[PDB]
């Protein structure tokens, strides 16, 4: 590979020079004769897999405290190796996982919130052993996260790997979604995107209420147990009515969301440790809820109501009439939730810190991994600085992965 | 291997094996994805090349391995022996002008891929020639304004210091004015090329839609500026349906799209010289001609007339202004019956269009970056749709600009 690779950005001409792609330590997808970038997703790791996985990794955090080949660094490496030696593992101590975990995210090329990477309140919950423990760890999670709406990116993280049969998972996508049910007529209430985990639950035990907005509990799997359902209190969900500064009807629809986005079936990999149950919250970018949550077919796929309500012609695709109806829906989304002084940020501003943040990692670290297609906003993409943006994607490690969905690989007890 | 790509809406898979026909190179490797980088002979190269080409060509027409197709291969083969070049049959010029449009990775439009009139020019020596060519393709494509796609083909490339080239982007753009105060009347994405056409001759009108001038050069000779005649040149003022003083604005586009600066590629000779044309979707003038920072940027002004709150970008002033930029481009072609199409009927056949080619062809390349349109990407069938990009041939490429590599 070559040494230095230049990215250009077509509206302003800033060129920048990436050197950190010489680091990267897992596939893309990509050859050389062909290009999987809009791909959506394109047993233990044995002693030897894992050594240098481990010293990998602790070179890296030893060289970032600036003691890279001091005698703590040839220690840490000695120790480590010993415990690989005799137990087939390792554990980090509490510097190495809160490092660990700020440069997943620093690392995730497809986050355009990675500005605030360094800002991250790790919870090491490596001490948990049962469900109904997971069920206090994620509670506590959510109310320090929340903070009343002034939200707190946070982290959780699980005991890792062992065998690969003591896994700790949650089932849940995100920690608050909604339910969705199928109807026999083949409709559906609530929303389409969670109606096989809902028939889990259901299946579980849940006891549906069978409404729009009905949060979903908590199913959860400590050391490899089959999995145990949990009600979310539900004073620690925060919700925000959705209402737009002029159009009075739009209350009427009677949509709300949740104010906390937490990602829960993700898998954190440090030093080639794997920690299957790590969920983690930011806040959100209004089109997220706006474009993606409401507006997506297989979504709640109310642009049609909200056009008739605005009495836009619906026969001609050429009057634009999608596109008016989503913008007043985010513009919706971003009013709520800002009168109601839960934090979100719209997809100007986000985009905007982005370039900041790429060109200062550009700066500091040489190079900035970032996946264009996950970048750049599902809505008015060439008005915002991340389009005409040149990026470059590859995989640094510690990083979140995809991992298969529990259900699939559990083998029930 | 087989490689599989699925929509993620209506959870379609489809199943590419086209892929395994490539030999150019993508840019990316195993270990960097480059999908967002713009830009990442002689004879002994010559023979495979068109050996290939033949090959393709004979296996489309499905005569492979016939008396023709033998004959052919040993005429390509004596004509590089003694000359280092070949000459395309006509028929072999319209299969690879066709294909190399079938296997642009970048275009939406190409359902329309084997609806392509093909003008040869390889006879033309001349700028005046060159004038004459282009003229009569912008007559024959613009057709009144239900518009025909189109290419002009000039004669290949033959030591590298004969090429033929037009200079222009576009055979037709407006001009575009460096002001002393800072600023930018007319087009700003034209504003060298401009100053190039003012440092060669042309007088400028120095108005806001001026139709530059054809800057042409033929057999590496000096180009020569010429008027395109103004009645070749359909316009179409732009308004809008409910906004009464969108008019009052003073904007007009032109009506056909012709790019002319690309390079084709057909089975190892290269045509420096090539303009085609389609017709717009409606963003390419709405979203990126009008809005970008380094164009028209009128964004600004759309939104005063509208009212909006612009002083917090979470008002969305940027986004609705420019639904209703394009919404009366859409409006102001399809009142003077001028060929457009809409971003969604666009990306709906695009669909429909992948769906064939993997069915038929066994795959289709396609390049998510800039097969989504500028504007409201996911809610247009594209945005959901797995692709898998990658290079075959023949097909258009990207040349250095003409002025800095001719010797004057
Ligand atoms: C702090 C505010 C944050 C914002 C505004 C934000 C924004 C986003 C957005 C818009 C996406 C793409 C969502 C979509 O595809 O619709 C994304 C993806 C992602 N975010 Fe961030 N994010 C934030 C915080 C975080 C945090 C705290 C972490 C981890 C500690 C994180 C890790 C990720 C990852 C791994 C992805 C990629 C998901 C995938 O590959 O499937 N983000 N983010
Ligand atoms: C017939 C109607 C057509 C439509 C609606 C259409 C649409 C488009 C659009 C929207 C783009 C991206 C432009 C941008 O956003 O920057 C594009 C790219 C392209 N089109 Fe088409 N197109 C059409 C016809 C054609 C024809 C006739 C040809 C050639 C014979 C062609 C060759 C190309 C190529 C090569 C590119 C990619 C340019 C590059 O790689 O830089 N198109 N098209
Ligand atoms: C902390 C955080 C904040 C935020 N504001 N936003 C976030 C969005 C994601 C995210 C978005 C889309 C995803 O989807 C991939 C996918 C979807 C459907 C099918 N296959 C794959 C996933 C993966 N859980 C995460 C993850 C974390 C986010
Ligand atoms: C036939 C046709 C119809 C249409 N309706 N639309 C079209 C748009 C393009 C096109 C779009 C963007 C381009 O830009 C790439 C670029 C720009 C600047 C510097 N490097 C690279 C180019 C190449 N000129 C062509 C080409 C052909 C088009
Ligand atoms: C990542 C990306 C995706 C996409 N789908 N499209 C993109 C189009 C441009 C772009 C490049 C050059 C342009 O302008 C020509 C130019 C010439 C010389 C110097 N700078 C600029 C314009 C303006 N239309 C857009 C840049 C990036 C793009
Ligand atoms: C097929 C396509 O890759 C897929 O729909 C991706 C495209 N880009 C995206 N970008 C973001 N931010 N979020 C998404 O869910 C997607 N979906
Ligand atoms: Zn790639």
Redesign the pocket.
């Known amino acids: 590979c070559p040494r230095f690779l230049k990215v250009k950005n077509?509206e302003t001409?800033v060129v920048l020079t990436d050197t950190l792609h010489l680091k990267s330590t897992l596939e893309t997808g990509c050859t050389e004769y062909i290009c999987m970038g809009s791909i959506m997703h394109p047993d233990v790791a044995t002693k030897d897999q894992l050594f240098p996985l481990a010293k990998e990794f602790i070179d890296q955090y030893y060289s970032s405290i600036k003691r890279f080949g001091s005698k703590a660094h040839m220690e840490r490496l000695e120790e480590v190796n010993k415990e690989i030696d005799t137990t087939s593992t390792y554990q980090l101590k509490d510097t190495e996982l809160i490092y660990g975990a700020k440069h997943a995210w620093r690392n995730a090329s497809r986050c355009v919130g990675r500005i605030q990477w360094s800002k991250l309140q790790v919870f090491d919950a490596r001490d948990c052993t049962t469900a109904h423990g997971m069920f206090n760890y994620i509670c506590n999670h959510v109310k320090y996260a929340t903070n009343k709406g002034n939200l707190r990116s946070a982290i959780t993280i699980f005991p890792q790997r062992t065998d690969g049969k003591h896994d700790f998972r949650v089932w849940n996508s995100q920690l608050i979604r909604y339910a969705g049910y199928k109807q026999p007529d083949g409709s559906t209430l609530g929303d389409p995107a969670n109606v096989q985990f809902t028939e889990i639950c259901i299946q579980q035990g849940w006891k549906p209420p069978r409404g729009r907005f009905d949060v979903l509990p908590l199913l959860l799997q400590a050391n490899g147990n089959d999995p145990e359902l949990f009600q979310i209190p539900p004073e620690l969900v925060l919700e925000v009515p959705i209402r737009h500064p002029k159009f009075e009807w739009f209350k009427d629809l009677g949509l709300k969301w949740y104010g906390l986005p937490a990602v829960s079936n993700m898998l954190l990999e440090i030093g080639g440790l794997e920690f299957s149950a790590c969920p983690f919250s930011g806040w959100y970018m209004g089109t997220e809820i706006g474009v993606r949550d409401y507006c997506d077919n297989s979504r709640y796929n109310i642009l049609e109501e909200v056009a008739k309500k605005m009495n836009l012609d619906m026969r001609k695709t050429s009057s634009l009439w999608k596109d008016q109806a989503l913008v007043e829906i985010n513009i919706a989304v971003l009013y709520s939730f800002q009168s109601d002084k839960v934090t979100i940020v719209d997809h100007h501003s986000a985009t905007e810190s982005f370039i900041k943040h790429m060109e200062n990692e550009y700066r500091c670290r040489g190079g900035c991994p970032a996946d264009?297609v996950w970048i750049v906003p599902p809505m008015s993409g060439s008005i915002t600085p991340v389009?005409?943006?040149?990026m470059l994607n590859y995989r640094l490690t510690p990083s979140f992965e995809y991992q298969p969905d529990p259900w699939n690989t559990h083998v029930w007890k």
Request: glycine share 0%.
């Open positions: 077509w001409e264009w389009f005409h943006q040149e």
